[PDB]
Amino acid sequence: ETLTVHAPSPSTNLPSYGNGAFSLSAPHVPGAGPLLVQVVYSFFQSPNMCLQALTQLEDYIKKHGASNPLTLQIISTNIGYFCNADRNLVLHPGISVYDAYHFAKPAPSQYDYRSMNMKQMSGNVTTPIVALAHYLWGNGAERSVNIANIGLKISPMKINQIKDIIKSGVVGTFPVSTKFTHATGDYNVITGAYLGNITLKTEGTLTISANGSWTYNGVVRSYDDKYDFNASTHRGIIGESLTRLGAMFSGKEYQILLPGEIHIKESGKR
Incomplete structure (x- = not known):
C-alpha cells in the first residue's frame, strides 16, 4: 500500500x-x-x-x-x-x-x-x-493543456488516408478528412509522459505535383475530448519514472482536456 x-x-x-x-x-x-x-x-x-x-x-x-x-x-x-x-x-x-x-x-x-x-x-x-x-x-480534478502547446510533429505519410493518396500515384489536389492515432512518446519524451497515445482529427488539402512532390495543409484537433492520467497511459522514459513514483505514493487519477487546434504545413517527396 x-x-x-x-x-x-x-x-x-x-x-x-x-x-x-x-x-x-x-x-x-x-x-x-x-x-x-x-x-x-x-x-x-x-x-x-x-x-x-x-x-x-x-x-x-x-x-x-x-x-x-x-x-x-x-x-x-x-x-x-x-x-x-x-x-x-x-x-x-x-x-x-x-x-x-x-x-x-x-x-x-x-x-x-x-x-x-x-x-x-x-x-x-x-x-x-x-x-x-x-x-x-x-x-x-480535471486539467487541460492546449494542443498548440504539446509540440506535435505530424507525419502525413503515417496517416493512412494521406499515405494512400500519395502512394496511389495520383497528381492534383485532394480533400483530406480523417482521424488517426498519434504516439507522442515516439518522438516527444515530455508530451509522451503524460498524454502518451492520443487520437487526432485532421481536415485539409493534399497537393501532389507530377514530380511526386507533395504538401499537406490542414487543421489538427484532438478527436477524444480528454485523456486519462494513470500509470498505464504514460509513455517514454519520463513516463516510466512517473509510473514507478505513482506506484509508491497515494493519489487519484484524473483526466486532461486537449482543447484547441493547430494549422500544419508538411511536405515530402514520393
Missing part, C-alpha cells in the same frame, strides 16, 4: 529544493572546466531537466527510503518548484524555463498547492512533474 506525500505549502516546504543538499542543474562534464550559466540555461529548456529532477527523487527514495519523513518533504518541496515554474510559464508565455524556474514570484520555497494550483498546464518541459503533482494532490 501507498504512502501519502503532503501537499506543498509554506508551512511544510523545506527552505530549498533538495533541502539544499542537491539542486537541479546541468550534468558534470569532466575536463570542461567550470559550469557556466549559458550551459545551465540551455539545460533548463531541454527535456533532460525534467528527467533529472525525477531521477533525483527516485535516487533519494532508494537511498533514504520512501517512508523517511525527509524523503516525503523533498518530494513535496521539489515538485512544488516545478508547479511554481509551470505557473509562471502559463502566465508569461514566451519566457525561458530557466527564468520561470529561478526568478518567479512568489519564491518556490513558498509554493502553496491548495491556493496556487492551476487547472491549465504549460506543455513545457516542467509539465510531467506538474501532472504528477495533480495525481498526488489534485483529488481527481
Whole structure:
C-alpha cells in the first residue's frame, strides 16, 4: 500500500529544493572546466531537466527510503518548484524555463498547492512533474493543456488516408478528412509522459505535383475530448519514472482536456 506525500505549502516546504543538499542543474562534464550559466540555461529548456529532477527523487527514495519523513518533504518541496515554474510559464508565455524556474514570484520555497494550483498546464518541459503533482494532490480534478502547446510533429505519410493518396500515384489536389492515432512518446519524451497515445482529427488539402512532390495543409484537433492520467497511459522514459513514483505514493487519477487546434504545413517527396 501507498504512502501519502503532503501537499506543498509554506508551512511544510523545506527552505530549498533538495533541502539544499542537491539542486537541479546541468550534468558534470569532466575536463570542461567550470559550469557556466549559458550551459545551465540551455539545460533548463531541454527535456533532460525534467528527467533529472525525477531521477533525483527516485535516487533519494532508494537511498533514504520512501517512508523517511525527509524523503516525503523533498518530494513535496521539489515538485512544488516545478508547479511554481509551470505557473509562471502559463502566465508569461514566451519566457525561458530557466527564468520561470529561478526568478518567479512568489519564491518556490513558498509554493502553496491548495491556493496556487492551476487547472491549465504549460506543455513545457516542467509539465510531467506538474501532472504528477495533480495525481498526488489534485483529488481527481480535471486539467487541460492546449494542443498548440504539446509540440506535435505530424507525419502525413503515417496517416493512412494521406499515405494512400500519395502512394496511389495520383497528381492534383485532394480533400483530406480523417482521424488517426498519434504516439507522442515516439518522438516527444515530455508530451509522451503524460498524454502518451492520443487520437487526432485532421481536415485539409493534399497537393501532389507530377514530380511526386507533395504538401499537406490542414487543421489538427484532438478527436477524444480528454485523456486519462494513470500509470498505464504514460509513455517514454519520463513516463516510466512517473509510473514507478505513482506506484509508491497515494493519489487519484484524473483526466486532461486537449482543447484547441493547430494549422500544419508538411511536405515530402514520393
